[PDB]
Design a protein around this ligand. Structure first.
Ligand code: SF4
Ligand SMILES: [Mg+2]
Ligand SMILES: [Mg+2]
Ligand SMILES: [Mg+2]
Ligand SMILES: [Mg+2]
Ligand SMILES: [Mg+2]
Ligand SMILES: [Mg+2]
Ligand SMILES: [Mg+2]
Ligand SMILES: [Mg+2]
Ligand SMILES: [Mg+2]
Ligand SMILES: [Mg+2]
Ligand SMILES: [Mg+2]
Ligand SMILES: [Mg+2]
Ligand SMILES: [Mg+2]
Ligand SMILES: [Mg+2]
Ligand SMILES: [Mg+2]
Ligand SMILES: [Mg+2]
Ligand SMILES: [Mg+2]
Ligand SMILES: [Mg+2]
Ligand SMILES: [Mg+2]
Ligand SMILES: [Mg+2]
Ligand SMILES: [Mg+2]
Ligand SMILES: [Mg+2]
Ligand SMILES: [Mg+2]
Ligand SMILES: [Mg+2]
Ligand SMILES: [Mg+2]
Ligand SMILES: [Mg+2]
Ligand SMILES: [Mg+2]
Ligand SMILES: [Mg+2]
Ligand SMILES: [Mg+2]
Ligand SMILES: [Mg+2]
Ligand SMILES: [Mg+2]
Ligand SMILES: [Mg+2]
Ligand SMILES: [Mg+2]
Ligand SMILES: [Mg+2]
Ligand SMILES: [Mg+2]
Ligand SMILES: [Mg+2]
Ligand SMILES: [Mg+2]
Ligand SMILES: [Mg+2]
Ligand SMILES: [Mg+2]
Ligand SMILES: [Mg+2]
Ligand SMILES: [Mg+2]
Ligand SMILES: [Mg+2]
Ligand SMILES: [Mg+2]
Ligand SMILES: [Mg+2]
Ligand SMILES: [Mg+2]
Ligand SMILES: [Mg+2]
Ligand SMILES: [Mg+2]
Ligand SMILES: [Mg+2]
Ligand SMILES: [Mg+2]
Ligand SMILES: [Mg+2]
Ligand SMILES: [Mg+2]
Ligand SMILES: [Mg+2]
Ligand SMILES: [Mg+2]
Ligand SMILES: [Mg+2]
Ligand SMILES: [Mg+2]
Ligand SMILES: [Mg+2]
Ligand SMILES: [Mg+2]
Ligand SMILES: [Mg+2]
Ligand SMILES: [Mg+2]
Ligand SMILES: [Mg+2]
Ligand SMILES: [Mg+2]
Ligand SMILES: [Mg+2]
Ligand SMILES: [Mg+2]
Ligand SMILES: [Mg+2]
Ligand SMILES: [Mg+2]
Ligand SMILES: [Mg+2]
Ligand SMILES: [Mg+2]
Ligand SMILES: [Mg+2]
Ligand SMILES: [Mg+2]
Ligand SMILES: [Mg+2]
Ligand SMILES: [Mg+2]
Ligand SMILES: [Mg+2]
Ligand SMILES: [Mg+2]
Ligand SMILES: [Mg+2]
Ligand SMILES: [Mg+2]
Ligand SMILES: [Mg+2]
Ligand SMILES: [Mg+2]
Ligand SMILES: [Mg+2]
Ligand SMILES: [Mg+2]
Ligand SMILES: [Mg+2]
Ligand SMILES: [Mg+2]
Ligand SMILES: [Mg+2]
Ligand SMILES: [Mg+2]
Ligand SMILES: [Mg+2]
Ligand SMILES: [Mg+2]
Ligand SMILES: [Mg+2]
Ligand SMILES: [Mg+2]
Ligand SMILES: [Mg+2]
Ligand SMILES: [Mg+2]
Ligand SMILES: [Mg+2]
Ligand SMILES: [Mg+2]
Ligand SMILES: [Mg+2]
Ligand SMILES: [Mg+2]
Ligand SMILES: [Mg+2]
Ligand SMILES: [Mg+2]
Ligand SMILES: [Mg+2]
Ligand SMILES: [Mg+2]
Ligand SMILES: [Mg+2]
Ligand SMILES: [Mg+2]
Ligand SMILES: [Mg+2]
Ligand SMILES: [Mg+2]
Ligand SMILES: [Mg+2]
Ligand SMILES: [Mg+2]
Ligand SMILES: [Mg+2]
Ligand SMILES: [Mg+2]
Ligand SMILES: [Mg+2]
Ligand SMILES: [Mg+2]
Ligand SMILES: [Mg+2]
Ligand SMILES: [Mg+2]
Ligand SMILES: [Mg+2]
Ligand SMILES: [Mg+2]
Ligand SMILES: [Mg+2]
Ligand SMILES: [Mg+2]
Ligand SMILES: [Mg+2]
Ligand SMILES: [Mg+2]
Ligand SMILES: [Mg+2]
Ligand SMILES: [Mg+2]
Ligand SMILES: [Mg+2]
Ligand SMILES: [Mg+2]
Ligand SMILES: [Mg+2]
Lengths: 208, 99, 82, 96
RNA sequence: UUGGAGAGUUUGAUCCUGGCUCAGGGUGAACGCUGGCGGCGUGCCUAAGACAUGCAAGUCGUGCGGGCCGCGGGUCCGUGGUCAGCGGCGGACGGGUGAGUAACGCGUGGGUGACCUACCCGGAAGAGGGGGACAACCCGGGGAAACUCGGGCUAAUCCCCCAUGUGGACCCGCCCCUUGGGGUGUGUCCAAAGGGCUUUGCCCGCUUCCGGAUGGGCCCGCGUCCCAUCAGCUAGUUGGUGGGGUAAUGGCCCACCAAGGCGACGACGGGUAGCCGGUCUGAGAGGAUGGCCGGCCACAGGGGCACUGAGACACGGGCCCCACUCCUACGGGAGGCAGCAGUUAGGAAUCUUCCGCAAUGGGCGCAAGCCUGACGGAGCGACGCCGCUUGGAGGAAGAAGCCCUUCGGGGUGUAAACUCCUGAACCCGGGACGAAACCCCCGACGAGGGGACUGACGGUACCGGGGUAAUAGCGCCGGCCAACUCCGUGCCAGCAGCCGCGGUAAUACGGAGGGCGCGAGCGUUACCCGGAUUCACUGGGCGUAAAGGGCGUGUAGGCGGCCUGGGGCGUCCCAUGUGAAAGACCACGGCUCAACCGUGGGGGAGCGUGGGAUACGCUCAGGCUAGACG
RNA sequence: GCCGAGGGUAGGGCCCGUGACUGGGGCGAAGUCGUAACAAGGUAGCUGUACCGGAAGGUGCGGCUGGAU
């Protein structure tokens, strides 16, 4: 299925911190904060300049490994935005975002997307009422995403809403803390989201 | 409508029957250029009044014999041997194409 | 006789009929003469039955013969009404 | 190891007899008439012809000959007959 | 204007030409390793080789007469179930397969004054009077069987004669029309059936005719692959006349008569293929393709033929011939899976001898209802697409083991251990949507209103409660191309798509550590398009790279100067018909999403018709002298 | 009685598989013989044709420069 393995080796390769755990990403026990160099026997050697192809694959796995997403779902989501109207780059990001497993995390229901999945797959989430255990739901404007009442009294979701008391959440999302319910206002302009990614280059990876 | 064609009589050597050659132009579907193709029809001349070189009109009709599906509609022109000679000379050239 | 009946479309465990006029000798989902509406037996949509009623009557005035569970679907949409 | 298709073949044979039977008769009196009108003898020729037409249209009632067949047959019967009388004449009965 | 990337390889080096090769997407796939769940699709591409067994087409007692058994009750009657029979309607639908066919088979636009259509609707009219056969059944003869002949009786919606002629048909005549269309007069010919209830009234049916609707037949224009190392082909051949034949035209068939018909715009011949909507690829143009699904065709062991029929030259009907297999009582007789499963053979390779008529649909029936391997579902197969799992947070300047090291240390690695949190699987309870009709009821057997019966999938999905940390594999790491070190080997063993690697320090072979790429998948083989502007219409070339005919002359053909008018063929525009459905696309909506599916929207070419335009190319006509000749 | 599936007789056409033996061709190579071509390649080369020679080739005739000086 999904990646499901050692995750610090990921940031270490990408050269950048991706926020793939939650808590530890912020402490100084974070791997990039100890070793900002690719994992394995040859990480401390001096790099050799990567080729154009080398560069693009790398920018792709960057954006991709963020989301914990399979290449198929990535490709298909991409090859949607390739077909659908307007500028490709924004729409790909947009459709990436409308994922429930993402939506849950951007709201702070979860500390990671990886946790935001187990939250989704274990039904602890609901969309406009109905229980939803599908990480892949394309959330639409006007949707209200909340916790199930039948699980609302759980240590993890209560404790994880504790941080959220007045925490900022992106412009297109609102959040009734304590009440455990959030709202999807619209899909992003590239501005709204600052993923550490040059998104044009991913198009060009696929232009090959 | 009963498809009406215009063409030249090039042989009347049968009883109550003429050969009306019809020509057509259209542009080549891949190569653009307009090209000439043509065809011979057997037309029913019950009134055996038509001669070699006549340009006439023919109309698709109920079957008369095998092959014969058109009757001659009306005369259009007379004495166009220059055209029959076009047809007749292409035939004569076929002798120099064998072994 | 030319008949009025329900050509099945949709998918498995997802029935979706097209109320239609086709030859009685056609295969159930074959090429037909004219479409005159649809019908969804699971009623999972606001309008699970719609009928151009002016049309169906043309055929009736000329000899189309409704199936039993089509006769009903025209009755519920009141084509038989006076 | 069987069915009702047998019943249907048994039926088809019995209708077969009946069909042939008329056709031979029909063709018999037709020629018999046309035979006479050729050497006519107009009255007998015309008389027998009435039993031809009769036996024809009756065949037309059923499976034997379709409507246009009986029509087709009569137009070749009469047209042959009358014009055979033009070689002599005159038509002594009806008709017509 | 939503659409277009290139690289490796001839050289010491260069530029160019040119091929080879690669990275992409795709498939009814197959093979290797591996393999957890579900949904929707989908699965003999080879031998249209051969097949055990069951099942795939029957139905009506509201057509008739019966035998048996039963309930009734007096040998007889009603009546029930059943079995054949006679008679209806169906069996020409549905389902299968792609052999044959290069063809009016298909696609597209049209013709039919040259045609048909059972059941259905609508319009007009009618049902009078007699007669008769064969099965059932009885009685003989012959077999293991297939069953079979003869003799005798019997009913009907079974066959036949007369009558009626609204009407129809046919010949002759006139009018209209204009290919055999419409009308009419003389003559002639043709109708029919009862059954059942609530019974001087309705319901199912019957007969003649007209129109409708639907399904067809036939005909024409145009489009449809390779070899010209197939160049000439043709005796029913091509036409005429007269007949035969059919619903109907026609050499479709026959007789006679004429000497004709076809061909480099590729006849004839050989090869290959069912065609299309579409599918795949592609920036487009184009290329490739036709499995699933929808339309048409063709075929039903191989051929030929007809019969019954509105319709067939008929898959589960008939006759014959052939090949093949079988059964036998050894005298004789039967079969046709390219229906659904299943066996076998061939093959790299392709499924359960399932459940059900509940639904949709079809056939019979007044109706109940009966039949339905169509169909609705279920089974099997990672074959395909889609969703989903093997957990999440915390957790050392960082355990052991293993790899590397200049022996200081670097790495696997937050990875593990361990802590808390969640709760796939499984256990308990609830439990579908899909199914309201037919029928019954009042009303009127109608309109309308009311009633009850019915679920294969299935105790499944789903809803609620409880609850276990719960499968990961495969390819690659010389350049293309993302990923590097140690050892082992020593032109050996081996790798290989191309260039190339291996001859004692191989990042290229074998293992390991580490790393890169995907993930219930990953790789391999085969094939299709792409990269290949490498058949070049878009969009290439020929002095020396592959490429000007040895030179003339001329046939067909392609192409053509300046001015004016007629026509309007090409060309452009407008209006209209067709361009089915599914699919594609855009929006929305339903399955928790998605795959899948529903609803609506938008078109196009191309062809038919009507009207318009006249510059260019065309044609016709009249001039000119710049081209050409004298 | 005609036509007629097909069976039988006879002679022809195209294609496929195969055949003692035979002709050259591709590849392999660490073999034998010579040295024809590339330098004026030690007789300038190539060429159509003709005759000849173990083999590359030679020579005649005419042609070309894509021949050094
Ligand atoms: S710790 Fe630093 S490296 Fe490890 S996951 Fe969080 S961010 Fe990426
Ligand atoms: Mg981030
Ligand atoms: Mg760059
Ligand atoms: Mg776009
Ligand atoms: Mg961020
Ligand atoms: Mg691409
Ligand atoms: Mg031609
Ligand atoms: Mg004729
Ligand atoms: Mg029967
Ligand atoms: Mg006789
Ligand atoms: Mg008949
Ligand atoms: Mg009849
Ligand atoms: Mg453009
Ligand atoms: Mg490219
Ligand atoms: Mg090289
Ligand atoms: Mg070279
Ligand atoms: Mg080199
Ligand atoms: Mg190249
Ligand atoms: Mg591929
Ligand atoms: Mg496998
Ligand atoms: Mg296995
Ligand atoms: Mg399945
Ligand atoms: Mg097959
Ligand atoms: Mg064999
Ligand atoms: Mg065998
Ligand atoms: Mg059965
Ligand atoms: Mg009845
Ligand atoms: Mg019964
Ligand atoms: Mg019975
Ligand atoms: Mg059928
Ligand atoms: Mg079929
Ligand atoms: Mg099927
Ligand atoms: Mg085929
Ligand atoms: Mg051919
Ligand atoms: Mg056609
Ligand atoms: Mg044609
Ligand atoms: Mg057509
Ligand atoms: Mg009687
Ligand atoms: Mg009697
Ligand atoms: Mg009478
Ligand atoms: Mg050619
Ligand atoms: Mg004739
Ligand atoms: Mg002929
Ligand atoms: Mg003859
Ligand atoms: Mg062949
Ligand atoms: Mg074929
Ligand atoms: Mg291209
Ligand atoms: Mg094909
Ligand atoms: Mg196929
Ligand atoms: Mg199909
Ligand atoms: Mg056949
Ligand atoms: Mg067979
Ligand atoms: Mg047979
Ligand atoms: Mg056959
Ligand atoms: Mg019938
Ligand atoms: Mg017929
Ligand atoms: Mg049959
Ligand atoms: Mg048959
Ligand atoms: Mg057939
Ligand atoms: Mg069969
Ligand atoms: Mg047996
Ligand atoms: Mg015996
Ligand atoms: Mg026998
Ligand atoms: Mg059997
Ligand atoms: Mg085998
Ligand atoms: Mg099988
Ligand atoms: Mg199946
Ligand atoms: Mg049913
Ligand atoms: Mg039914
Ligand atoms: Mg009925
Ligand atoms: Mg049955
Ligand atoms: Mg069954
Ligand atoms: Mg099925
Ligand atoms: Mg340390
Ligand atoms: Mg460390
Ligand atoms: Mg360690
Ligand atoms: Mg260490
Ligand atoms: Mg962890
Ligand atoms: Mg229900
Ligand atoms: Mg617990
Ligand atoms: Mg790979
Ligand atoms: Mg790659
Ligand atoms: Mg690299
Ligand atoms: Mg060794
Ligand atoms: Mg070594
Ligand atoms: Mg390698
Ligand atoms: Mg290695
Ligand atoms: Mg998947
Ligand atoms: Mg594969
Ligand atoms: Mg290619
Ligand atoms: Mg090309
Ligand atoms: Mg060009
Ligand atoms: Mg070129
Ligand atoms: Mg020259
Ligand atoms: Mg010459
Ligand atoms: Mg010249
Ligand atoms: Mg000329
Ligand atoms: Mg010209
Ligand atoms: Mg000009
Ligand atoms: Mg002009
Ligand atoms: Mg014009
Ligand atoms: Mg149009
Ligand atoms: Mg369409
Ligand atoms: Mg939705
Ligand atoms: Mg388009
Ligand atoms: Mg003009
Ligand atoms: Mg002039
Ligand atoms: Mg001059
Ligand atoms: Mg013969
Ligand atoms: Mg013979
Ligand atoms: Mg024989
Ligand atoms: Mg040989
Ligand atoms: Mg040899
Ligand atoms: Mg040899
Ligand atoms: Mg030398
Ligand atoms: Mg020399
Ligand atoms: Mg020399
Ligand atoms: Mg010489
Ligand atoms: Mg010697
Ligand atoms: Mg010498
Ligand atoms: Mg010279």
């Amino acid at each position: 299925g999904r990646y499901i393995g050692p995750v610090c080796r990921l940031c270490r390769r990408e050269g950048v911190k991706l926020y793939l755990k939650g808590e530890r990403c912020y402490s100084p026990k974070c791997a990039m904060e100890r070793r900002p160099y690719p994992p394995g026997q040859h990480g401390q050697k001096r790099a050799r300049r990567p080729s154009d192809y080398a560069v693009r694959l790398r920018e792709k796995q960057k954006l991709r490994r963020i989301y914990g997403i399979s290449e198929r779902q990535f490709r298909n989501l991409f090859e949607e935005a390739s077909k659908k109207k307007g500028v490709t780059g924004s729409v790909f990001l947009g459709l990436l975002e409308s994922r429930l497993d993402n939506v849950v995390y951007r709201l702070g229901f979860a500390v990671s997307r990886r946790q935001a999945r187990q939250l989704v797959r274990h039904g602890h989430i609901t969309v406009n009422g109905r229980r939803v255990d599908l990480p892949s739901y394309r959330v639409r404007p006007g949707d209200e995403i909340a916790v199930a009442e039948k699980s609302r009294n759980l240590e993890l979701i209560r404790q994880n809403l504790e941080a959220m008391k007045g925490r900022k959440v992106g412009p297109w999302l609102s959040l009734d803390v304590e009440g455990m319910k959030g709202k999807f206002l619209r899909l992003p302009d590239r501005e709204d989201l600052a993923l550490p990614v040059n998104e044009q280059l991913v198009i060009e990876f696929y232009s090959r | 409508p009963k498809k009406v064609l215009t063409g030249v009589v090039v042989s009347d050597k049968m009883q109550k029957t003429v050969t009306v050659l019809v020509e057509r132009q259209f542009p080549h579907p891949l190569y653009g250029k307009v090209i000439k193709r043509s065809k011979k029809y057997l037309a029913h001349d019950p009134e055996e009044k038509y001669k070699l070189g006549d340009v006439v009109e023919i109309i698709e009709s109920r079957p008369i014999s095998k092959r014969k599906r058109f009757r001659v509609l009306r005369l259009v022109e007379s004495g166009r041997m220059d055209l029959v000679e076009k047809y007749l000379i292409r035939r004569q050239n076929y002798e120099s194409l064998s072994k | 006789m030319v008949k009025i009946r329900l050509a099945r479309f949709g998918s498995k465990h997802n029935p979706h009929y097209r109320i239609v006029v086709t030859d009685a000798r056609r295969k159930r989902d074959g090429k037909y003469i004219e479409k005159i509406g649809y019908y969804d037996p699971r009623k999972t949509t606001p309008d699970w039955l719609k009928v151009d009623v002016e049309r169906a009557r043309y055929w009736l005035s000329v000899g189309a013969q409704p199936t039993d569970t089509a006769r009903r679907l025209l009755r519920q949409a009141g084509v038989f009404r006076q | 190891r069987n069915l009702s298709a047998l019943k249907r073949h048994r039926q088809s044979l019995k209708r077969r007899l009946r069909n042939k039977a008329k056709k031979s008769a029909i063709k018999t009196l037709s020629k018999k008439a046309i035979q006479l009108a050729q050497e006519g003898k107009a009255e007998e020729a015309l008389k027998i012809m009435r039993k031809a037409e009769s036996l024809i249209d009756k065949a037309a009632k059923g499976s034997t000959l379709h409507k246009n067949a009986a029509a087709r047959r009569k137009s070749r019967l009469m047209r042959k007959v009358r014009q055979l009388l033009e070689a002599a004449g005159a038509p002594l009965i009806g008709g017509g």
